[PDB]
Design a protein around this ligand. Structure first.
Ligand SMILES: Nc1ncnc2c1ncn2[C@@H]1O[C@H](COP(=O)(O)OP(=O)(O)O)[C@@H](O)[C@H]1O
Ligand SMILES: Nc1ncnc2c1ncn2[C@@H]1O[C@H](COP(=O)(O)OP(=O)(O)O)[C@@H](O)[C@H]1O
Ligand SMILES: Nc1ncnc2c1ncn2[C@@H]1O[C@H](COP(=O)(O)OP(=O)(O)O)[C@@H](O)[C@H]1O
Ligand SMILES: Nc1ncnc2c1ncn2[C@@H]1O[C@H](COP(=O)(O)OP(=O)(O)O)[C@@H](O)[C@H]1O
Ligand SMILES: [Mg+2]
Ligand SMILES: [Mg+2]
Ligand SMILES: [Mg+2]
Ligand SMILES: [Mg+2]
Ligand SMILES: [Mg+2]
Lengths: 519, 537, 526, 77, 134, 107
């Protein structure tokens, strides 16, 4: 007879958290894998969202249980660190907790469960690293295969042939492939434009802007010299309170004339540099482009794009080599950007786009134009392309590749079963639970594919025991096979981060024993 | 209760005399008197358990849920959400005792309740309430004269402060701060004696700043002969300590001058604009140069300043405080001996104050800083910095120390001292009994009742101390009458002796006289009421 | 009779007055509720709580900090509010002990209710408790040891104190890691106690062991547009100027002219004033310019043309930490460059953490301020890690201030209880029976510590009491196996400051709650 | 400053001067005079006392008591 | 320092009972003696009753406090045993309790008050018998 | 009081079956101690009568009849001896007559 445990609310709270987490995991289990389907989510305001992304789904469904909120945060963290695996990580967490259920029932302490899970996590990191193979970013076929694998799960998979090479070119254009250890995907701009179909998605090497052109008649410019103007082309206005007191009739005409002359001198100093395309920053508190200024620029045959946003300035400069000018005195030729073409293109009556294509200084920036027949499919195309870019980012960060189709999860189950048999004690039960919990991703892949999950997962385990560690669930043939012939590969970072974050979240939730209702 | 008018007519026609007479109430006569007495007795029996060293505290909760633990009768009755008008009168009585004296706020209420409780039995026997009030006035006069007779006197000099420290310890014995009994008494005495006008016999409490900061221990409470401010130096790279500080006190913001009248400075040319720019620059430089040429090593402004002024102070090695409040500016001037300057042009080396130490003080893991100004030459201002483990004990420490300061003030106003522990009350009760024996009119009963009421304070002390009330009080009364010693009272602390002059239990004569007078006057005003009218709901 | 139970009620509709037993009942029940709530978080094997606010934001916190727990609950019992404020003041004074002071106060009040039932006056109880507080103070102070002189032993004591502070918290998973982090970060302050100098950046993602202490400094601000991104041998000007449509402080000033030409001349003059300001800045010989305020397009362009990296919109804390880390002087006037000290660091680059870019200052000069990047799987994990790190850093700062240390694992509480017991059995009267209760509460502290682990608390506290009665003043709980051991060897040591504060604040709050015999509530504002 | 009009008029009738909207002619005929001026503490409040005016056609009662209504009924009496 | 008396509800109950009893006594005090007057009592049903009899008055006014009910029963018992004195007995009871008020406040135990009252009662019966004439 | 001690023990983390076990052992010990301390005087008629008077006095001490305990003790003892060994307590009729003093009561 040990300690009576006079209180049962800690155990009830643990069981409630485990139940909530397993419920979330089982709710999103259906959106896992190439044969997984999407969920529609109608917000309280009526914003509809069709998606296959686990992080998106969990953030969008306003879960209420604390454990479910924590799983949402877990999926967001996985989306940050890897950008792919946001469903697998939640499923793994839910499964680990569902195993903690029976462990707790057996009568093991939550601290012992947590420590044994940490042990299993370290061993599993070892196993995944051993499974991994190195990759060179020059292996364009390997990159294409990673991107196709990332896209197979999404609505954009019949267009994978189109969006994988784009997702590889984009990332390979915004990094120095020899020195890069990461990538900032803010260098990759995505522009969602309704209309057409997803086969109309495009990779624009130059710059794309949604701002409209103010000139009528001047839509296309060849051999374009472009200048960014952070000052206002309108009547002068000091930063102090200023007035113009008229006391004689002559001063009225004088005021109008001097205003005209000021504006004309401005536009002449602009024209004198050879600038024929003019991007004007957005200006509140003062008119950035007066009617006089627009008249004069149009007469001088200069394309004008105002309302540029103060957050797109660094991007536009990085793109077309321009330098932002805030005083007319410093507006010279060395502050311009040379582009082989600047055109206002129409998209079959579905809007207009300004494309600045060709650049003498195309500095590590690219844009992707996302087309589509519906707002929902456009949003999911954007999310999926982001997932592909994040997969390439994982490959850039960690030069290691792992097979897919549940092969890593199955190898984990197997080798951690062995580890458990070697770690005799009460940690053995917990490690065996960890293994059987990691055996759930292949089971889910099979279930979603439409196979018999038990038979499929047993065949997988048997073949991995024989030694085919690169063996997985071939949803094309309908059974098990060497998954590299199907070319299902994913960065090691995805699986490693998923496992790590799921284990940390499980340990945190296991360290909880009470819930309070603050105020 | 009863209604204003219950006839509606001897003819059946409507009889409406007072507005909303049907919703209004009225109580008349002896039942009204007894209702008053019941309410007053309820209040007094609430308060009587907070009397003496072994007295317990009360936990007051306001409308918004803030908690106040206290033994102060005035604070209790002010925090008390009373609806009865006689209870409101008793709250006013206690507040009056606090205003005039600053101590006795519970004795006044207990005594008034006892007087009304005895008037209850006198009214039952059929005496006119005005006759009761007049007998109470007579007995109160007798008791006041007996207090003047048995009073003692203490020396209020600054050389030997032991009598004043004993008085303050007696005052603070009943408060939660009796854990630091002598430290608190010492700092109250030193505070009033530092800031007290001996010739005028006046003590201005605006010159005593009582500041509290959570953290530390109650034992950390100390007396600063100077000022503490809730500010820090204006620039984070300024030094946090300044020794031999010559202080410039200024009520001019370190900013370009600005007329109070509606003004428009017109810029009409690039030359005008550049002249304005140079004027602003030179104004900032000239301000800082004037402060430096005055010889000051520290500046204290009331109205804050801007980046140029802050950096110029830093460059010129002039630590500075900004956004100091008017009262603290005044206290800093008074303490450092400096004069408050309204503009820099009017600043001279003689208008500066001197403090031997100006320091910025931290409070652990808080990020909040305080500024101490001390080591002045002859600071006529002072600060009491109170520490403790919670805001409840900090607030109680504040009010208890206020009680102690008020007691020392009352000593400075009149040095005569009676000894407490109920001894003075027992002696006045004996004197009143003797005068009632010599009184042959019908007021004899009222005076005997007044004596029996005066005797409730020793009984209350005994009860709160667990002793048997009647036994203890009768024995000490018998001893007082046998061996003439009006310093025989209740051994609340169980020191063995009943001699309060030996236990150093000390009260102020004006305090006791004010207690008796206020209780008697309010009891008279209550007994004189025989009709209440109140609106419905 | 009584205020409430009188033929006339003297109160406004909605008020109330609980008398002696009712008041003591509600007070003891509230305090003991608070204490039972906050325990089970006590000690290495303590477990966390979910706060789960109920507002329209429905905040969600996972905490082990007693101060945080008490702050984030809707309390309506006045005595409970007293204990809550006590724990808050403990958290303000030091950064640890916020659960131990509350548990101690609650146990003392439980024993006090027991004594009231034993028919003891709640003034004899406070008297005996004051005597016991004196005895415990003296025993603790005599048991304290100081190693600030020996630098190596002081470093070891710092590592042990950080480890003991983190043991109870979610960071015990990587305790050997976060201990080193916290100790290095508190030593980088070079004796200063400014805990604002230690900045903590919580970056969602990564494991909790991916967290680190930057060898230099990190800043979550942006660089201008046409300005460099890498700078070697950086000379830095930290400023607080306007550099944003900076107007002459004369506020009645207005431009009143008769010509648009004159308006344009004045506008050009404003621009020339800004240009001259920028030129005065550049005459300091700098490569980096940090401003507390914004930097508008024109000075941004000027700094870009000059080849200077101009970081804008750092805050008061940002520029303070930068001055501490580089050595510069926060300036707002540039007419005396010889007097403005510049900051230096070997390199300033832009690094990635998660998906966000940050300014990285490497090779800094002073380093008296620090940046800690906290990585984690959930925002709850990150917030709890920040709270735990704040605890550890506060304790290490308080120890650098006062190097006195005191062994943990219930050794200190048991020693104090031993002293109180000697005083009690040598003192006559019922004050002895109250001192014994004081000691019982002191013993109930490690009792709870052991209970939360799952051991035979009664047996282990009996062993500890026997050891401290025999004279093994260093015996404490060994929470690895669940036995008693030598705290001096196991490295379980606490700050004398924190233990003394726990003791004294608990005794003080219990005293102030015990003096209450009436609770008079006023009609809620509703 | 902000002295009430009635107290100012009483100070005038007591000390023997006149109230001046302009400070340009402050002669001894318009200035007032008393034998003693003091600021003292009176029961929690601070009061300014002008005493010693022999030509005073005014007086000020200062009523003490333990309640607002006590003092009000004293004033009515 | 004796026993703390951690509970105050006993004293509150004693004082409430004493107050109720004294209130009844003072309410019927006016119907005592040759110069005493009668009370009219209109029942809930509207049955009017004018009376000078203490037992009748107390039985007809539906007193609610327990002590007042007990005084009603006391007056009924006096009406049974003697048929005269039903007002004097209630007044005496109320007055004895009104004295218990100040005794309790002085700090005497209710048991001591009861025993001393029994002593005084026996002595008073002795005194009244001495006064009596056959 | 037993349940108060049991809550204390549960807080001490003792199983409420170990508590019942120890309580049963304690009940056995208390039973045996009580039974060994018990004394019988039914044989001696005079001492048995004295024990009856003492038991009646002890039973009435706690009650309102402690005022006239020496009277009501004799009442109760005589009334229980008039039953001549039978236990029929309905045989003892009690008539409550309002009026008179409590000492006017009789058998
Ligand atoms: N063509 C395929 N054949 C077999 N398995 C696949 C294929 N494509 C993807 N998978 C598997 O599907 C999983 C990815 O599913 P996905 O819906 O992206 O979940 P997550 O968002 O968690 O990555 C990976 O574990 C991968 O092994
Ligand atoms: N140490 C002591 N011994 C005996 N009597 C004391 C002692 N200290 C104070 N008293 C008495 O307690 C009475 C109540 O004073 P107290 O309640 O402390 O202040 P207040 O009445 O202003 O609230 C005083 O009349 C005083 O004589
Ligand atoms: N490794 C350890 N071994 C034994 N006791 C420990 C250990 N770490 C902490 N403690 C004990 O746990 C207590 C700290 O628990 P904590 O949750 O920090 O409470 P608090 O918030 O009140 O400081 C201290 O009293 C200390 O003695
Ligand atoms: N003519 C009288 N003169 C003086 N006293 C009288 C006279 N008649 C009656 N009493 C007194 O009045 C009392 C009777 O009053 P009563 O209304 O009968 O009250 P109770 O019903 O309690 O006796 C007696 O105590 C008696 O002494
Ligand atoms: Mg995917
Ligand atoms: Mg006092
Ligand atoms: Mg801690
Ligand atoms: Mg009669
Ligand atoms: Mg019995």
């Amino acid at each position: 007879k040990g300690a009576y445990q006079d209180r049962d609310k800690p155990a009830q709270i643990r069981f409630s958290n485990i139940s909530a987490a397993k419920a979330v995991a089982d709710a999103i289990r259906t959106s896992l894998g190439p044969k997984g389907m999407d969920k529609m989510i109608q917000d309280g305001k009526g914003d509809v969202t069709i998606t296959n992304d686990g992080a998106t789904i969990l953030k969008q469904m306003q879960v209420l249980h604390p454990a479910a909120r924590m799983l949402v945060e877990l999926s967001k963290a996985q989306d940050i660190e890897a950008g792919d695996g946001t469903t697998s990580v939640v499923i793994i967490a839910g499964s680990l907790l569902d195993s903690c259920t029976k462990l707790l029932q057996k009568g093991i302490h939550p601290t012992i469960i947590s420590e044994s899970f940490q042990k299993a996590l370290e061993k599993g990191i070892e196993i995944l690293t051993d499974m991994s193979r190195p990759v060179e970013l020059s292996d364009r076929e390997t990159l294409l295969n990673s991107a196709t694998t990332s896209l197979n799960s999404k609505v954009v998979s019949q267009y994978s042939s189109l969006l994988s090479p784009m997702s590889v070119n984009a990332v390979m254009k915004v990094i120095d492939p020899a020195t890069a250890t990461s990538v900032d995907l803010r260098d990759i701009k995505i522009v969602k434009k309704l209309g057409g179909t997803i086969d109309d998605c495009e990779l624009v090497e130059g710059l794309v802007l949604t701002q409209k052109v103010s000139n009528s008649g001047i839509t296309r410019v060849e051999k374009a010299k472009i200048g960014l103007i952070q000052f206002c082309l309108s009547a002068p206005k000091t930063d102090m309170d200023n007035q113009i007191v008229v006391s004689d009739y002559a001063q009225m005409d004088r005021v109008l004339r001097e205003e005209r002359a000021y504006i004309l001198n401005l536009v002449k100093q602009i024209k004198k540099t050879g600038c024929n395309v003019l991007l004007i920053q957005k200006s509140i508190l003062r008119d950035a482009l007066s009617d006089l200024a627009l008249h004069f620029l149009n007469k001088m045959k200069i394309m004008v794009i105002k309302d540029i946003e103060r957050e797109d300035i660094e991007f536009i400069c990085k793109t077309i080599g321009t330098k932002p000018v805030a005083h007319i005195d410093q507006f010279t030729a060395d502050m311009l950007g040379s582009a082989e073409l600047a055109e206002e293109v129409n998209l079959n009556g579905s809007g207009k786009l300004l494309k600045i294509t060709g650049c003498a200084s195309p500095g590590k920036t690219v844009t992707i134009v996302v087309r589509g027949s519906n707002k929902l499919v456009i949003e999911e195309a954007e999310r999926s392309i982001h997932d592909a870019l994040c997969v390439i980012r994982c490959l850039v960060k960690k030069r290691a590749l792992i097979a897919g189709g549940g092969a890593p999860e199955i190898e984990l189950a197997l080798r951690l079963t062995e580890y458990s048999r070697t770690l005799s004690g009460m940690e053995s039960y917990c490690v065996r639970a960890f293994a059987d919990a990691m055996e759930v991703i292949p089971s889910t892949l099979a279930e979603n594919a439409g196979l018999n999950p038990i038979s499929t997962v047993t065949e997988l385990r048997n073949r991995h025991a024989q030694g085919e560690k690169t063996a997985g669930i071939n949803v094309r043939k309908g059974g098990i096979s060497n998954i590299l012939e199907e070319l299902v590969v994913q960065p090691l970072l995805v699986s490693v981060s998923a496992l790590t974050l799921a284990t940390e979240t499980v340990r945190s939730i296991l360290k909880i024993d009470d819930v309070v209702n603050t105020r | 209760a009863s209604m204003g008018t219950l006839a509606f007519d001897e003819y059946g026609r409507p009889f409406l005399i007072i507005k909303d007479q049907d919703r209004k109430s009225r109580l008349m006569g002896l039942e009204a008197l007894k209702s008053h007495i019941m309410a007053a007795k309820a209040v007094a029996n609430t308060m009587r358990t907070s009397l003496g060293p072994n007295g317990l505290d009360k936990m007051m909760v306001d409308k918004d849920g803030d908690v106040t633990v206290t033994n102060d009768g005035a604070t209790i009755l002010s925090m008390m959400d009373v609806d009865h008008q006689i209870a409101k009168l008793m709250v006013e009585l206690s507040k009056s005792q606090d205003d005039e004296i600053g101590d006795g706020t519970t004795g006044v209420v207990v005594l008034a309740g006892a007087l009304l409780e005895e008037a209850e039995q006198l009214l039952d026997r059929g005496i006119h309430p005005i006759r009761i009030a007049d007998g109470y006035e007579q007995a109160a006069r007798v008791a006041i004269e007996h207090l003047d007779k048995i009073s003692d006197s203490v020396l209020v000099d600054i050389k030997d402060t032991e009598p004043l420290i004993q008085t303050a310890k007696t005052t603070l014995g009943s408060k939660v701060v009796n854990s630091c009994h002598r430290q608190m008494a010492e700092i109250a005495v030193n505070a009033v004696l530092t800031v007290a006008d001996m010739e005028r016999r006046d003590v201005d409490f605006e010159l005593i700043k009582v500041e509290g900061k959570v953290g530390g221990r109650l034992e950390d409470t100390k007396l600063i002969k100077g000022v503490i401010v809730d500010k820090d130096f204006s620039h984070p790279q300024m030094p946090k300590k300044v020794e031999d500080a010559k202080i410039a006190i200024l009520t001019c913001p370190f900013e370009p001058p600005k007329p109070k009248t509606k003004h428009k400075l017109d810029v009409t040319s690039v030359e005008d604009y550049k002249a304005l720019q140079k004027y602003e620059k030179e104004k900032f430089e000239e301000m800082i140069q004037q402060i430096k040429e005055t010889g000051a090593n520290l500046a204290i402004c009331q109205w804050g300043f801007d980046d140029e002024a802050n950096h110029l102070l830093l460059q010129n090695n002039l630590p500075a405080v900004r956004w100091v409040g008017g009262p603290e500016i005044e206290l800093i001037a008074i303490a450092t001996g400096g004069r408050i300057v309204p503009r820099f042009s009017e600043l001279t080396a003689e208008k500066l104050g001197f403090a031997g130490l100006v320091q910025e003080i931290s409070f652990g893991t808080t990020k909040d800083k305080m500024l101490v100004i001390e080591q002045c030459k002859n600071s006529r201002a002072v600060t009491i910095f109170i520490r403790g483990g919670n805001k409840m004990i900090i607030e109680e420490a504040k009010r208890s120390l206020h009680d102690a300061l008020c007691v020392i003030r009352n000593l400075i106003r009149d040095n005569r001292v009676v000894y407490g522990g109920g001894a003075a009350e027992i002696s006045c009760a004996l004197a009143v009994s003797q005068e009632a024996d010599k009184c042959p009119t019908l007021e004899q009963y009222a005076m005997r009742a007044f004596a029996d009421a005066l005797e409730v304070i020793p009984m209350a002390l005994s009860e709160n101390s667990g002793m048997n009330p009647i036994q203890t009080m009768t024995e000490v009364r018998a001893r007082q009458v046998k061996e003439m010693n009006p310093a025989l009272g209740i051994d609340c602390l169980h020191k063995g002796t009943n001699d309060m002059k030996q236990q150093h239990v000390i009260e102020t004569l004006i305090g006791k006289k004010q207690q008796i007078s206020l209780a008697t006057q309010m009891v008279r005003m209550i007994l004189k009421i025989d009709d209440i009218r109140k609106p419905g709901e | 009779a009584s205020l409430s139970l009188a033929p006339v009620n003297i109160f406004k509709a909605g008020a109330d007055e609980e008398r002696a037993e009712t008041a003591r009942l509600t007070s003891f029940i509230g305090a003991i509720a608070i204490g039972d709530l906050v325990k089970s978080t006590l000690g290495p094997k303590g477990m966390d709580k979910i706060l789960l606010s109920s507002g329209r934001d429905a905040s969600l916190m996972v905490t082990n900090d007693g101060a945080t727990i008490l702050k984030n609950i809707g309390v309506d019992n006045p005595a409970a509010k007293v204990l809550v404020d006590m724990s808050r003041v403990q958290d303000d004074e030091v950064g640890d002990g916020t659960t131990s002071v509350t548990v101690l106060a609650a146990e003392l009040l439980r024993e006090a209710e027991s004594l009231i039932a034993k028919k003891i006056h709640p003034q004899t109880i406070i008297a005996g408790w004051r005597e016991a507080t004196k005895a415990a103070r003296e025993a603790l102070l005599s048991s304290a040891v100081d190693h600030g002189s020996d630098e190596v032993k002081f470093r070891q004591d710092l590592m042990n104190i950080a480890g003991t502070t983190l043991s109870s918290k979610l960071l015990t998973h990587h305790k050997d890691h976060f201990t080193k982090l916290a100790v290095e970060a508190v030593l980088r302050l070079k004796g200063s106690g400014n805990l604002e100098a230690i900045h903590i950046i919580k970056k969602l993602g990564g494991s909790l062991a991916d967290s680190y202490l930057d060898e230099g400094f990190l800043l979550d601000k942006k660089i201008g547009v046409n300005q460099p991104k890498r700078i070697e041998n950086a000379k830095i000007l930290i400023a607080n100027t306007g550099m944003d449509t900076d107007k002459i402080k004369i506020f009645g000033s207005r431009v009143r002219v008769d010509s648009t030409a004159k308006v344009a001349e004045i506008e050009h003059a404003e621009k020339e004033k800004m240009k001259e300001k920028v030129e005065r800045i550049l005459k300091h010989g700098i490569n980096c310019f940090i401003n507390r305020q914004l930097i508008y397009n024109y000075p941004e362009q000027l700094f870009g043309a000059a080849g200077v990296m101009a970081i804008e919109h750092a805050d008061f804390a940002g520029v303070e930490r930068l001055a501490l880390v580089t050595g510069g002087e926060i300036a707002s006037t540039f007419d005396h460059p010889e007097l403005v000290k510049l900051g230096s660091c070997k390199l300033i680059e832009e690094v990635m953490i998660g998906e966000d870019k940050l300014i990285h200052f490497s090779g800094v000069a002073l380093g008296e301020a620090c940046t800690i990047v906290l990585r984690g799987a959930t925002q709850q994990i990150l917030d709890e890690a920040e709270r735990s790190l704040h605890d550890a850093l506060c304790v290490l700062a308080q120890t650098v201030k006062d190097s006195r240390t005191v062994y943990g694992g219930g050794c200190s509480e048991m020693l104090m209880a031993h002293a109180v017991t000697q005083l009690a059995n040598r003192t006559p009267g019922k004050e002895a029976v109250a001192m014994e209760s004081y000691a019982k509460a002191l013993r109930m502290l490690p009792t709870i510590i052991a209970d939360n682990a799952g051991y035979d608390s009664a047996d282990l506290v009996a062993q500890l009491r026997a050891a401290h009665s025999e004279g093994n003043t260093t015996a404490g709980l060994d929470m690895r196996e669940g036995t008693i051991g030598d705290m001096a060897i196991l490295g379980i040591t606490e700050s004398f400051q924190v233990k003394r504060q726990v003791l004294l604040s608990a005794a003080e709050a219990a005293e102030v709650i015990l003096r209450v015999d009436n609770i008079i509530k006023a009609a809620p504002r509703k | 400053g902000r002295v009430p009009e009635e107290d100012l008029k009483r100070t005038m009738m007591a000390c023997g001067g006149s109230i001046q909207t302009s400070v340009n002619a402050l002669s001894a005929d318009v200035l007032g005079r008393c034998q003693v001026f003091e600021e003292t503490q009176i029961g929690g409040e601070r009061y300014n006392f002008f005493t010693g005016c022999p030509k005073a056609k005014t007086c000020t009662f200062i009523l003490r008591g333990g309640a607002e209504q006590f003092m009000e009924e004293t004033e009515r009496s």
